[PDB]
Amino acid sequence: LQYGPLAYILGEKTTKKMTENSKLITVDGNICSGKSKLAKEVAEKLGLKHFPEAGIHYADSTTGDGKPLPVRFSGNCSLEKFYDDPKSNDGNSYRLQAWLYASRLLQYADALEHLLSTGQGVVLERSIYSDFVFLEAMYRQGFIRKQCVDHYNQVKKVTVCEYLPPHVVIYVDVPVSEVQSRIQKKGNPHEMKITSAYLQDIENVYKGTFLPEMSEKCEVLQYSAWEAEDAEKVVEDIQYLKYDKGPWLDQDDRKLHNLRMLVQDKLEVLNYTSIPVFLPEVTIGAHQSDRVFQEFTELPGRKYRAGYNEDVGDKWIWLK
């Protein structure tokens, strides 16, 4: 372990690198809001690091070779099957949503660690504070049950409460007809199978639940469809902001050091994600878990720790 309390004793203070440009900015929107490139523009305007949307193989990408692991080893859920049958028997919907929330939590932990260590601000898309707007859009469409909803609420309550919200959020306002037309012109062979009621529900939860609390707990900006293209207006608006809200104001060196200690233990971040609540859409019995665990242990680069694999070509294993 490199960073510890000994470093903080020796003078590794995290507000030494906390300049005025170290800002946590997340951008939101609809299914095909076109924000995906816009944040990239911010990555070439304020110099901030940008992170893509947390996919299924994001945890596969961050460690090991970074290659996409097969869906049996990680996820066991596919977006194409969700677009095919949302009310399926095996419960692809809630399993996919729980896996994506876990991946987004891992992405937010990595983003917070990078911001706290390197001192450089970070731009994200659809952070963990804007994921339930998907799940509620499932429940109002009947895609899941009530037990899944309260289990997700318990998971969010035990996971979010140890973290701080981002500095500025940006929501791109794209209506339902524009979203459906953009999906039609995009050309994905499986993306038209969702009803427009799902996009309407996403927009309704966005403008009914997300904005009334992100107008209070953090800084909020709102833009229409065409105003998202004008990058200079957006960066001038975010660079001329007066931060008075949010708990980022009352952060001393001790609290940020504790946060840095907590986000550098990836087991500690995801310890409360998979609580022992037995909901038949996410629990898997002993036989399949044992089989897939023994198969994952046979994968190259994963049988031992990252510095102790002979089959991938690590030398001086006997002197460590």
Binding site: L1, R305, G307, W316
Partner: protein, 49 residues
Amino acid sequence: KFYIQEPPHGSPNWLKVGLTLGTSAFLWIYLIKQHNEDVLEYKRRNGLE
């Protein structure tokens, strides 16, 4: 290389390895010297000379 990020345990910590080797050698020679001194004092005390 195989791992995209460099692992913290990728390279052997040579300072810690040398410290472990030196500590083992020092403790071994200290134990041997202590045993030799104690057995010499024992044979001088009880006259098994």
